[model samples]
Target: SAQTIEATSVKQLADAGVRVGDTLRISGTGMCNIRSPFLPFDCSQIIWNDARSLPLPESELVNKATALTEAVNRQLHPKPEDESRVSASLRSAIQKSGMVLLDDFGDIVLKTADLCSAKDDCVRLKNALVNLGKDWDALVKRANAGKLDGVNVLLRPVSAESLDNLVATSTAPFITHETARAAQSLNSPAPGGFLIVSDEGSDFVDQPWPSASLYDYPPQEQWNAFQKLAQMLMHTPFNAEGIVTKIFTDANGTQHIGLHP
Candidate 1:
């Protein structure tokens, strides 16, 4: 018989011997894509935790870091077409300087003192960029050395659909046997996938990770740490010997079926 419990943690569920096809009657939180009538649970339904523990390849890290640098560069210095209301001279000046102009500021020409301030600002920005590069390099070095293995790092959560898309594109093996079997059979669009829904409603997709450019300036330190970790976890290689060993709840009240190789 399937068991239902008021579990508070995955460890509790593990201790209680929870199994597949059993319902997790959780409170205080709701999950995404859970249809009404009966909250269908299937082998293809899996929840994505923002925290992951895995190692990534050096070449992949280099490519992702390059993309991150490009994203920050684009944010700091947008293309000429990004602004349509500006005058031709202003546009030309922006293109020549390769910096976005402030809203309250006007004119490209500046006095000697103002130019000095501009140079100082440029220097500060360059320093920040350099620091960002150093951080990326350090992360890559650690990842290549296997220093990041089994260390769970947090990242922004993506939508179930996005995760499905990522899995579809990946040549790597699925982490669970059920997911692989379901995917191989071409049964569902997102087999073994479950969406996390709450009072906020579903369809929540965080900024694209690793695959897309960041849209913010002075990239957050958290983002810097996550860049490498995200690449590593997302590209986890297939484990032919992987098997579902545990079913438990996460701190967020979401259930996860643990896989071990």
Candidate 2:
């Protein structure tokens, strides 16, 4: 029998305990219409575009942003490199201060000492931070000139565990159904706020970071973006992949990851 459109609606291969190279032989006509494994169902449901849902009051967002920026600045730009003054455990020091690496929009990053290690190392997050800052400043400079929806500044570092997950599941193109399902249940810890990043070494002191502040975004929106970015990254790895790709383990032993754009 021939058909114009065929449908093979299975719960999914992974959920059925199927592995790679598992064949789903179906005698049908027309296109099979395989979609990106990253998303099965209409994933667009997560989109929350309107600014109406954004987190605010303005002051709270600003404060959190300022706190994260200040914390990063102090940690990254320390007193003249005195070997003795150098912290033995960067994570320990940061923990004592009780500061999170991310606010809502941007993440306060430092140069990771070892990509394979934990966030315990805060040696050189600035090399990339300042590099990205160059872009951040440029965007803010033309903020009013253009439609400034939101900024995409990632601050989370991928863990070694996630790296291993990728290595094991490199065969699959996009995230599997199981992984995506796991991600669906996940939530972001970031409070609804965007951090204000400044070029401490900016030539123009007055226009350090444009108008001097960025606001708090709705945590859900930020979280959604964060999820998508991470998911994409995990699927399509790139240079410094480990830093950007984080892996999560679900209760069903499924590994989840992403790269939100």
Candidate 3:
């Protein structure tokens, strides 16, 4: 019953020991963030919203059955069983009202790598670099195609000679091999999907670190490269959409469902 069970607010959860970084969600499982239930409803007679809000009993057997059913149904909505006789009007209402809470308490985590910094300025600093004027424009044109080639040359440790030079253009020479592989595999002119690589800070640290290592820099060069990537997240603008999305892995190694598409 909605009456017997206590309703908790996000603020309350944060108060009663939820960490700032961890996502403390309702129902033990479900959406990361749900909306406030105190808002308006369609009519004066019917109570609408989440189970937490309605006038239903929190302890009654019938109420418990309804809650359990709703849990299963909502979790697997659009399944074969659910797609049956749910009326068009009810379906539309559910779609509009349903919300999932996402753990978005911001924290300093992986930084967005900025690739645009060295476009012209870095070239200007290289006094010995021959002015390949046409070549420069062509490469810029190629870059405009969306996914830039030669972006992860450092990660694919082929020949030692050119790796460091090619990587110097990146925000920092810390491109992970996993990221390099995924991006290079796409090799598309269209926007490419991203791959989130788990931190293997120690994996690469012990290697003799071929000149091709993300950059030839020592492992301690954290501020130099990591900070640049962090800034990239700050400066980059969204395409046409409101906010950009990325495929991320959960702490438990599960991938975000939205990444399936």
Candidate 4:
């Protein structure tokens, strides 16, 4: 069963404890204008909106998987003459029909010089490749089935207008925030939280208007100030001491920080 809640602002939605199988009925003036780096849904719900052009999880995954596959293929099937330089036994181990984890693949490629001399190296490399293949296969399977957790299927953006008479469904728990201040203003516990910080200060800054602007500082000084502000925004909020779960940058160079209780 699911419940529909009428939300007039991002703060209301953020504080609502929206869970999987829940629906949000968003309406009111400027309700569609709210935008945030952390919120998954497009507030405007307008088909031609630029926000709709943002990369989808499926496309990102496909791009990453393709690059990884190409790199692996290049390593496994090197230039014909260069292949002769590699030991037959070592080549056989490395050429095994399988994929490897990203880190393991990196390690194998980096330690190529030493692999020819050590029997243990061959065994370890083979195991890594086999495990990598299994991992890759599993990823592709899940991706094809639209069951990739926290990826495309689960994180698809919802149009606010579409939810006017429709129920939104989710399989995993997630959280959203319109601003750091909005998240801090929450009176109830949330599953998680996020905040985006940019070098160019926005209305969310607590400092006096002039001091918040980075235009007065030199390039390096501007960066230093931004770092300080970002650090403060990332911390110094909840009394419970939230844990930093993930940090990432957007194409605009804004930093997004994720926090978990």
Q: Which is the leading candidate under TM-score?
A: 1
Q: Candidates ranked by lDDT, best first?
A: 1, 4, 2, 3
Model 3 CA lDDT for position 180? 33
Which predicted model would earn the best lDDT? Answer: 1
Candidate 4, position 200, lDDT: 29
lDDT values, one for every candidate: 0.32, 0.27, 0.25, 0.30
Q: What are the candidates' C-alpha RMSDs?
A: 19.9, 24.4, 29.0, 23.1
Task: Give the 10-residue window scoring lowest on summed lDDT in candidate 4.
Answer: 168-177
Tens digits of lDDT, candidate 4, 19-100: 4444444332221112332122112121111121111112222233234434444543454455343365654454353321
Candidate 4 deviant stretches above 4 angstroms: 1-205, 210-212, 236-261
Write one digit per residue (lDDT tens) for candidate 3, span 174-253.
Answer: 33332233223322211111111112111101112223222344432432342332233222221110111233434543
Q: Cα RMSD for candidate 3?
A: 29.0
Can you rank all candidates by TM-score, best first?
A: 1, 4, 3, 2
Task: Report the C-alpha displacement of residue 46, candidate 1, in angstroms.
Answer: 3.5
Which whole-number lDDT from 0 to 100 does residue 114 have in model 4?
25
In terms of lDDT, model 3 sits at 0.25
lDDT of 1 by residue, 1-261 (tens): 766555443345445655654455432221222222111222122233333323321233223333433333343445656644447786566545533432211111111112223344323322322232144333444444444333422212232223223322221221122222322332222322222222222222222233332222122222333344334323232111123345555454555554333
TM-scores of all predicted structures: 0.21, 0.15, 0.17, 0.17
What is the Cα-based TM-score of model 2? 0.15
